[PDB]
Amino acid sequence: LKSALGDKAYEWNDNEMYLFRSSVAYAMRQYFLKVKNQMILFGEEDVRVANLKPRISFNFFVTAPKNVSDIIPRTEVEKAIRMSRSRINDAFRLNDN
Amino acid sequence: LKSALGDKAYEWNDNEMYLFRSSVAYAMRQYFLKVKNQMILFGEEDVRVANLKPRISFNFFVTAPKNVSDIIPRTEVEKAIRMSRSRINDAFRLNDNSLEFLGIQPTLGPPNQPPVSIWLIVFGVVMGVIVVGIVILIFTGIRDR
Amino acid sequence: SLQFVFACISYAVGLGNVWRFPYLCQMYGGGSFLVPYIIMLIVEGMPLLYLELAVGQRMRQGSIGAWRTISPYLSGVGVASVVVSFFLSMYYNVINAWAFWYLFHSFQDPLPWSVCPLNGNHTGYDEECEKASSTQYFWYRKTLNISPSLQENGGVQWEPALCLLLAWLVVYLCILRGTESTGKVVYFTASLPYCVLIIYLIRGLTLHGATNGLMYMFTPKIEQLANPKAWINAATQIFFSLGLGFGSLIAFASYNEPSNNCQKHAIIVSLINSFTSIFASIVTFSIYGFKATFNYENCLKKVSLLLTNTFDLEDGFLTASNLEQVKGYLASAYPSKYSEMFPQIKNCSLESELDTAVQGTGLAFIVYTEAIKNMEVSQLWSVLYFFMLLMLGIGSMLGNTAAILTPLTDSKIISSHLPKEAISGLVCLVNCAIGMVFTMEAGNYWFDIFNDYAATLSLLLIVLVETIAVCYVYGLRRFESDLKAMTGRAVSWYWKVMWAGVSPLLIVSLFVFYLSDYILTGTLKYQAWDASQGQLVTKDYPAYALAVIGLLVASSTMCIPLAALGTFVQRRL
Amino acid sequence: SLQFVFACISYAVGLGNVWRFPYLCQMYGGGSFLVPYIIMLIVEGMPLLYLELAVGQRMRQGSIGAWRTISPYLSGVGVASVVVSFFLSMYYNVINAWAFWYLFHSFQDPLPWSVCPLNGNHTGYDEECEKASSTQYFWYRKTLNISPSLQENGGVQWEPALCLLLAWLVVYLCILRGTESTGKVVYFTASLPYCVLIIYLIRGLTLHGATNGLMYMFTPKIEQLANPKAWINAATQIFFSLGLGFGSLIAFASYNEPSNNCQKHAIIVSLINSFTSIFASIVTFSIYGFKATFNYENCLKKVSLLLTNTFDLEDGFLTASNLEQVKGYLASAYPSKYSEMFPQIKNCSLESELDTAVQGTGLAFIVYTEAIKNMEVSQLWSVLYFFMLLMLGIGSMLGNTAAILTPLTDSKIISSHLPKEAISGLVCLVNCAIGMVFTMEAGNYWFDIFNDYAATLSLLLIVLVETIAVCYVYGLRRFESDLKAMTGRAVSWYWKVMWAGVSPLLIVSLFVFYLSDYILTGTLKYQAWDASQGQLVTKDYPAYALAVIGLLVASSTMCIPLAALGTFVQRRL
Ligand SMILES: CCCCCCCCCCCCCCCCCC(=O)OC[C@H](COP(=O)(O)O)OC(=O)CCCCCCCCCCCCCCCCC
Ligand SMILES: CCCCCCCCCCCCCCCCCC(=O)OC[C@H](COP(=O)(O)O)OC(=O)CCCCCCCCCCCCCCCCC
Ligand SMILES: CCCCCCCCCCCCCCCCCC(=O)OC[C@H](COP(=O)(O)O)OC(=O)CCCCCCCCCCCCCCCCC
Ligand SMILES: CCCCCCCCCCCCCCCCCC(=O)OC[C@H](COP(=O)(O)O)OC(=O)CCCCCCCCCCCCCCCCC
Ligand SMILES: CCCCCCCCCCCCCCCCCC(=O)OC[C@H](COP(=O)(O)O)OC(=O)CCCCCCCCCCCCCCCCC
Ligand SMILES: CCCCCCCCCCCCCCCCCC(=O)OC[C@H](COP(=O)(O)O)OC(=O)CCCCCCCCCCCCCCCCC
Ligand SMILES: *[C@@H]1O[C@H](CO)[C@@H](O[C@@H]2O[C@H](CO)[C@@H](O)[C@H](O)[C@H]2NC(C)=O)[C@H](O)[C@H]1NC(C)=O
Ligand SMILES: *[C@@H]1O[C@H](CO)[C@@H](O[C@@H]2O[C@H](CO)[C@@H](O)[C@H](O)[C@H]2NC(C)=O)[C@H](O)[C@H]1NC(C)=O
Ligand SMILES: *[C@@H]1O[C@H](CO)[C@@H](O[C@@H]2O[C@H](CO)[C@@H](O)[C@H](O)[C@H]2NC(C)=O)[C@H](O)[C@H]1NC(C)=O
Ligand SMILES: *[C@@H]1O[C@H](CO)[C@@H](O[C@@H]2O[C@H](CO)[C@@H](O)[C@H](O)[C@H]2NC(C)=O)[C@H](O)[C@H]1NC(C)=O
Ligand SMILES: *[C@@H]1O[C@H](CO)[C@@H](O)[C@H](O)[C@H]1NC(C)=O
Ligand SMILES: *[C@@H]1O[C@H](CO)[C@@H](O)[C@H](O)[C@H]1NC(C)=O
Ligand SMILES: *[C@@H]1O[C@H](CO)[C@@H](O)[C@H](O)[C@H]1NC(C)=O
Ligand SMILES: *[C@@H]1O[C@H](CO)[C@@H](O)[C@H](O)[C@H]1NC(C)=O
């Protein structure tokens, strides 16, 4: 954050993590609609987050809407994030670096 | 959308409405944390939307997280949206004239940079030079005549 | 050598070419103005100019002495011709004052005519600055502060007063450095205006909707070509641009040009003057057409947005081509909602906007300051153009002051106790003090009143009486024999008939037509600003206002029959 | 009049001042260079220059005939002095070729030295363009394509070949238009370099970290002031900038300056030469210090980012001041993770970067093209600066070609079947053809080899032998009496002792010191590019390479003892 915005950067509370999980859910919805021709209602509770560090850092994975044992593969999540990266960037004022 | 982005505008399906409801929920969370000092877990299902029109238009109101009969007043929602409008704009690539919350008006942009009559300075310098040339010329034409 | 051509160019190019001509052209139809302009040019700009130069070269005397010797009846024509230039100088310097002000306001960022101020509640821009544009508001309110009528005079302001004072001081300083300003310097002065006009033409021809202005300027419509107030104001604009009537050209080629040709001189002068006028009336009108088409597109966009927001329509559906289709479609879907909304649908067309966009006596200013905000670096071009206009102003100003100083520094009655510098400064100070009427709140109205009648009608009549005198009181055959014996060339019957017949009939016909169309309509209406709406309304002249309208032309033209009477009481003894 | 001063300025300012001096200054400590420079200037730039001008004015003969008449022993000094200029011209024109190329690559957007290319997988920039900067890569690879060694020669390229051909053609065209180029034109030519240097100084003094370059340039450290390879290369740089040894100054003030003062002339020349050198070696070093401090801050930022990403740290915590505190702190928290990461922590300091940032014979190019990307409009300043360098190049080139043409167009043996233009073009063509060695892949190494020895050592010895001859073979007292009787002024004992004693001892001492420090260390190492790492490594000269190093100074200096033998076999009969 400090690298991108300087002394104009917001602070990263858990509402920012809520917005990040919602952005990832939106990206998954869009990818599954525009490529797989399916409509799946991903939510912010299907994005599981781990290892939150203070240098802003974590891991996440995505689960089918109500089947906790169904993990979307890493490759499809990479595709879904490539498709919508320029929008997730804009939601936070970050620039791909 | 077409006014703001031109022939580069995305289409507005219901995933965009999902993202809008999540943005409004985030704004409400932030306002209730930073002003009321309370932590309330608003979600996207607490933003109720009505009257969706094809010129992009709707009404919305906000409900307490699990008490459907508890409607947050319109004034507090206006404050919560004023506090976070520049962020909701960025999430959609709109610029405060393409995303109108009817009843909430932007009131910024004051110009300030002049320390006085910047033009008076040049007027004065030119007048000084002119009067000096004038007295020089009168003196010359008087003592030489 | 080329020095003669460049001195001629310096002679011709003035302020009636870059400031007055476009203001007159836009006012009288545009297309319906050049046709009368060229007609009056060929019929009264060749013959009378050549006749005046020829008389000035033949008698080799001053403006008053020549007509004194031609006959004792005609001494007062010089007095009238001098009073005309005296009337000219005072209001003339205000145009230099205004360019001074605009120049002083060019060292800023952003320029004050490029944006609008904010309202009290800081939500939007000013209300008056939106009806008018960002430049019309700055002209009518920031640098003029015009009143909505002529009766609300108010009090003398202090910023335009200072600018006018500085203008008079700088013209004083230029006149104190000898009655000569050229010599090895003409190549720069005579060329700078044309260079800056080329620059602005390049800029203004690459603007969207520019061809509309040229179309409006050139193409004439035959409904205002029958307007007599166009012909007379086109002929006397020529009279004002060439310098006829002012007695300056007679006194110029008097102690000069021993036996050189006057025909070539007059032809070059008239051609370069008219060419300069027609070329400068194009760079302005390209930008004028741009402004008009912009305002028209704005009307259309505003109406489209209102219709879209009102019922509901996908943004971008109703643009500019289906506007009528959708207007009609919204009469078989729900007229119950449409009818009660009809008094808000603005009806805007391009012709009605090309007719009235920036009309007025500040046209040059508003239009030229409108093509600066649309440029890459604005302050540079603003400074350059306004310095150009200031050069032209000081030039025409010194040229006009020459015609009032020299017939005063020669009379051996008043030149006793007052030296040259003292009397020059006295005239300058009296002019600066009388020109303070035009720094008030309703000062632009008085400027407009003083401009037209005082600059046009007197001189139109005086050149007429000059021609009648030289043709039928001195002898046409005597004069042609004199000029043949002096220069060694016979004038063609072309000029011989133009001097005697065509001009002294055309001028009188043009005068009686205008006087009749004044008598058959009644009182005349001038204009106003109407700050609350943003357009020029046409309020009436008050009764006391017609007093000065009469007195100007009277005191500047009725000096002939009093000379013809003073020369009659002296011939009694 | 000022014409004399401006002609003197044109005389002095060349390419040894704006191109060679900074490259030499950076190479030898910077601060430890001006002190030897000023010392050698005062002790060998005043006396020998004045002596040379005085001899050229006294004998009023050519470069060869003067020393022919002084003694029959000393005719070959002119032949050696001409061979020196012949050696100079060929590699000299390559500097104009390079400026030609850079000029042709200035009509683009963006400029090719302002960005790096992309890699094959399009993820990041090129690998070589990142180790080096955007300008060092463009110099070493795009316009030169240097090889990592001297043995990998390769084949003649076609772009630099064409640029060099065009350079020779344009110098041909300038020489064909008479052996004169000044006259009512000196005020512009002599002034343009100064103006552009003021512009670039203004630009380069407002860059962050500029004071570091000036500190490095001025402040001397006493550890390389004991380096003999600095003193000799500082003295012979003076010898190369003033034109000594080339036989041009003798032949210049021979058919000119009848009885004017030579002391004032020589003093003004030396002063303006040294002043221009010192003033031009500042605009470059401000930008050099900027480059060095930028690279240092980059090292620091990269290391900080690696440490942050590695363990975990709030972004913005470890900036540049707690770097050592945190480095130490991460040794009592978890060294198990730290130790195995130690060989990646780059150790970067500012001194080690100011010492080696852009060093090399293209310093002027890389540095000046580095302060263009940091400017408002780049193409304009690039075009201006490179046209300036081209003017200086053509000037010094014609000045050097004069010393090889005139001692050839006068001998009445070869001027029979070959006219002036033909022989001029023949020499130009032979030079253009021999200069094709410097358009190969390892051509910059050959340029560097040809530069130093051939431009320095021969001339250093020839001015020595000139002074010995004029002092102890012609008679000091005879010469001072001759000059007193000719000019009417006695030379002070100041110059009398400088001619005889101090210079002929200092030059020999400087030569024996350098020859000893060559004999006590062994072979010398030049440099390389090492594209795979991005810095100048110091590979050794091959054995066959020392052959040309010997032959250059031999064939350019051993023409004295063969003249002393040809004049001995003719004196037998
Ligand atoms: C802004 C207004 C501008 C005003 C500029 C106007 C300046 C000139 C105004 C007068 C022009 C009208 C001519 C009227 C005829 C004069 C009356 C008269 O002669 O009195 C009869 C007068 C007798 O009149 P009585 O009073 O009826 O007996 O005759 C005299 O005996 C007067 C003696 C003459 C003294 C010589 C003075 C020399 C100066 C004259 C020059 C002035 C004319 C300027 C023309 C310049 C050309 C060289
Ligand atoms: C921007 C518009 C404003 C521009 C600037 C305008 C200002 C310029 C106005 C200048 C007005 C004064 C000009 C000064 C001229 C030089 C002054 C000078 O040399 O003074 C020496 C000097 C000034 O006084 P001092 O301090 O003793 O030198 O005056 C004398 O001593 C000469 C003696 C004068 C004799 C008086 C009698 C003259 C009249 C005889 C009877 C007839 C009365 C009629 C009067 C005629 C009046 C119409
Ligand atoms: C487009 C810009 C202007 C174009 C003109 C370029 C410059 C023209 C140079 C003038 C030529 C004269 C050179 C010197 C000879 C003097 C002339 C001469 O001797 O005259 C006496 C000459 C002697 O003839 P006489 O009757 O046999 O004695 O008079 C004439 O007969 C010529 C009459 C021609 C009338 C002027 C030309 C136009 C009249 C027809 C209607 C014009 C429509 C206006 C629309 C214009 C649209 C732009
Ligand atoms: C890039 C390389 C640049 C080369 C430029 C060098 C040009 C000059 C090279 C020669 C300079 C060395 C001087 C050696 C003395 C000459 C040898 C000799 O005289 O032969 C003995 C020669 C007898 O020698 P023997 O063969 O041993 O019997 O004496 C003669 O009888 C020759 C007859 C003289 C003919 C007159 C020709 C006039 C042209 C001479 C001018 C050339 C010198 C240029 C100096 C310019 C100053 C005005
Ligand atoms: C950028 C680097 C390159 C720059 C450009 C370099 C190119 C320039 C090189 C120019 C080379 C040719 C120069 C042309 C000069 C003018 C041509 C011309 O006027 O020709 C007229 C003309 C050319 O032929 P045309 O087509 O009939 O006119 O030649 C003649 O007719 C004259 C008769 C010549 C007599 C030949 C006998 C001369 C020698 C006698 C025996 C001794 C042999 C030794 C020879 C000495 C050679 C060292
Ligand atoms: C900073 C840029 C340069 C500054 C100098 C500005 C221009 C100076 C103009 C030269 C003055 C001469 C005017 C004409 C008179 C000719 C001189 C003359 O007659 O000489 C014979 C003159 C005659 O004296 P005699 O021995 O009594 O015959 O010789 C001298 O005695 C003067 C010796 C002075 C030595 C040169 C000055 C410096 C030497 C001391 C060490 C310098 C440290 C170097 C560090 C410099 C740092 C920048
Ligand atoms: C939840 O997702 C898992 C896959 O992650 C589904 O498991 C499959 O179940 C079918 C039969 O039900 C088996 O034939 C497959 O082999 C299972 N796949 C794997 C990877 O184990 C499971 O059915 C899903 N449950 C629901 C309720 O949708
Ligand atoms: C849900 O919200 C409503 C308010 O919108 C709460 O209603 C209040 O209930 C208390 C007692 O329970 C009454 O004294 C108040 O008068 C009520 N307010 C209104 C406006 O009616 C209700 O209690 C909330 N329910 C829960 C479970 O939190
Ligand atoms: C724009 O044009 C319309 C039609 O040309 C104008 O509406 C007409 O108004 C007159 C009265 O002024 C009625 O008698 C007509 O019946 C109207 N026409 C229609 C089709 O309804 C309208 O007034 C114009 N706009 C403005 C602002 O005047
Ligand atoms: C940066 O500096 C450190 C310390 O000054 C260097 O680390 C030393 O390396 C030598 C061997 O070359 C060891 O004997 C020392 O014990 C090391 N010092 C410490 C404190 O561990 C380090 O090598 C330098 N960076 C680079 C790239 O060489
Ligand atoms: C706008 O300003 C006016 C006074 O200039 C004020 O009466 C009005 O309340 C303001 N608008 C709003 C929305 O407050
Ligand atoms: C204008 O509206 C019509 C429908 O009436 C539509 O078919 C057409 O595409 C529209 N034009 C544009 C440019 O959108
Ligand atoms: C980068 O390019 C190289 C070849 O230049 C290739 O081997 C490598 O796979 C590329 N990187 C990726 C991530 O594909
Ligand atoms: C550097 O780190 C220390 C902790 O070791 C911290 O107190 C200090 O504020 C840091 N400096 C900056 C400029 O952030």
Backbone torsions φ then ψ of A50, nearest 5 degrees: -145, 155
For residue D167, give the nearest of D366, D384, D393 by alpha carbon: D393
Alpha carbon of residue D362 to chain centroid: 10
Q: Which residues does chain A break after (C to N > 2.5 Å)? A: none
Provide CB contacts within 8 A for D495, sequence distance 6+. Answer: D46, D47, D50, D51
For residue C128, give the nearest of C140, C112, C110 by alpha carbon: C140
Q: Tell me how many degrees the CA angle C37-C43-C49 measures, rounded to the nearest 5.
A: 100
Instruction: Tell me the C-alpha distance between B14 and B20, whole Å.
Output: 10
Q: How many CB atoms lie within 10 A of CB C224?
A: 15
DSSP A43: -
Residue D429: CB within 6 Å of ligand 5? Answer: yes
For residue D59, give the nearest of D78, D80, D44, D42 by alpha carbon: D78
D123–chain A Cβ distance below 8 A for any pair: no
Instruction: Tell me the C-alpha distance between B144 and B124, whole Å.
Output: 30
In the numeric block, the tokens 């560097």 are attached to D448
Provide CB contacts within 8 A for C159, sequence distance 6+. Answer: C101, C143
Q: At what angle do helices A14-34 and A74-92 cross, to 10 degrees?
A: 120
Query: Hey, CA dihedral for D244, D246, D250, D253, is it positive or negative?
Result: negative
CB D365 within 8 A of CB D98: yes
Provide CB contacts within 8 A for D214, sequence distance 6+. Answer: D282, D285, D286, D289
Q: How many CB atoms lie within 10 A of CB C550?
A: 10
Instruction: Tell me the C-alpha distance between C214 and C293, whole Å.
Output: 12
Q: Which of A22, A30, A93 sits opposite B22 (nearest CB)?
A: A22
**HEC letters along C173-185:** HHHHCCCCCCCCC
One DSSP character per residue, D179-228 reads S---SS-HHHHTTHHHHHHHHHHHHHHTSTT-HHHHHHHHS--TTSTT-H
Instruction: Tell me the C-alpha distance between C524 and C516, whole Å.
Output: 13
One DSSP character per residue, D409-446 reads SS-TTTSSSS-HHHHHHHHHHHHHHHGGGGGSTTHHHH
Pairing verdict, β B57-62 and B47-53: antiparallel
Instruction: Tell me the C-alpha distance between C99 and C96, whole Å.
Output: 5
Instruction: Tell me the C-alpha distance between D157 and D152, whole Å.
Output: 14
Q: At what angle do helices D262-310 and D2-12 cross, to 10 degrees?
A: 50
Q: How many CB atoms lie within 10 A of CB D158?
A: 9
> What stretch of H or E contains C261?
none
- Per-residue tokens: C191: 């060329």
Closest ligand to C118 CA? 11
Terminal CA-CA length for chain C: 56
CB C497 within 8 A of CB C487: no
Pocket test for ligand 4, best of D60, D61, D406, D411 (most atoms within 8 A of CB): D411
For chain B, what's the residue count?
Answer: 145
Q: Which residues does chain C break after (C to N > 2.5 Å)? A: none
Q: Where are the alpha helices (DSSP H) in chain B?
A: 2-5, 14-34, 74-92, 118-143
DSSP B35: T
Quick check: helix, strand or coil at residue C334? Answer: coil
- Per-residue tokens: D405: 């043409």
One DSSP character per residue, A5-37 reads HSTTPPP--HHHHHHHHHHHHHHHHHHHHHTS-
CB C392 within 8 A of CB C92: no
Assign residue D122 a region: left if phi > 0, alpha if psi is -120 to 50, beta otherwise? left
Alpha carbon of residue C45 to chain centroid: 17
For residue C62, give the nearest of C81, C86, C44, C90 by alpha carbon: C81
DSSP A63: B
Terminal CA-CA length for chain B: 80
Provide CB contacts within 8 A for D135, sequence distance 6+. Answer: D113, D366, D369, D370, D373
Question: Which residue's CA is the closest to the ligand 12 atom numbered 12?
Answer: C317
CB C315 within 8 A of CB B3: yes
Quick check: helix, strand or coil at residue B116? Answer: coil
CB C171 within 8 A of CB C398: yes
For residue D220, give the nearest of D98, D39, D376 by alpha carbon: D39
Q: Tell me how many degrees the CA angle C217-C222-C223 measures, rounded to the nearest 5.
A: 105
Burial annotation B69-99 (CB, 10 A radius, 16+ → b, else e): eeebeeeebeebbbebbebbbbbbbbeeebb
Alpha carbon of residue C76 to chain centroid: 28
Q: How many CB atoms lie within 10 A of CB D445?
A: 24
Instruction: Tell me the C-alpha distance between D538 and D524, whole Å.
Output: 10
Instruction: Tell me the C-alpha distance between C392 and C386, whole Å.
Output: 10
List pocket residues of ligand 12, CB cut-off 6 Å.
C 319, 321-322, 325-326
Instruction: Tell me the C-alpha distance between C83 and C455, whole Å.
Output: 11
> What stretch of H or E contains B96?
none
Q: Which of D309, D312, D315 sits opposite A2 (nearest CB)?
A: D315
Quick check: helix, strand or coil at residue C510? Answer: helix
- Per-residue tokens: C275: 């060419």
Instruction: Tell me the C-alpha distance between D548 and D62, whole Å.
Output: 31
Q: Tell me how many degrees the CA angle C311-C315-C318 measures, rounded to the nearest 5.
A: 75
Instruction: Tell me the C-alpha distance between C28 and C9, whole Å.
Output: 28
Closest ligand to C93 CA? 2
Instruction: Tell me the C-alpha distance between D537 and D102, whole Å.
Output: 26
β partners of residue D299: none
Half-sphere exposure of C118 (CA within 13 A, CB side): 11
Q: How many CB atoms lie within 10 A of CB C259?
A: 8
What are C129-133's contacts with CB under 8 Å, separation 24+? C131/C533, C131/C534, C132/C534, C133/C291, C133/C295, C133/C370
Assign residue D560 a region: left if phi > 0, alpha if psi is -120 to 50, beta otherwise? alpha
Provide CB contacts within 8 A for D475, sequence distance 6+. Answer: none
Q: Tell me how many degrees the CA angle C274-C279-C284 measures, rounded to the nearest 5.
A: 125
C107–chain B Cβ distance below 8 A for any pair: yes
For chain A, what's the residue count?
Answer: 97
- Per-residue tokens: C171: 């013209």
Instruction: Tell me the C-alpha distance between D155 and A1, whole Å.
Output: 53
Alpha carbon of residue D306 to chain centroid: 41
- Per-residue tokens: D19: 């191109």
Provide CB contacts within 8 A for C324, sequence distance 6+. Answer: none
For residue A15, the chain B residues in CB contact (below 8 A) are 26, 29-30, 33
Residue C347: CB within 6 Å of ligand 9? Answer: yes
CB D37 within 8 A of CB D235: no
Q: Tell me how many degrees the CA angle A92-A94-B1 measures, rounded to the nearest 5.
A: 60
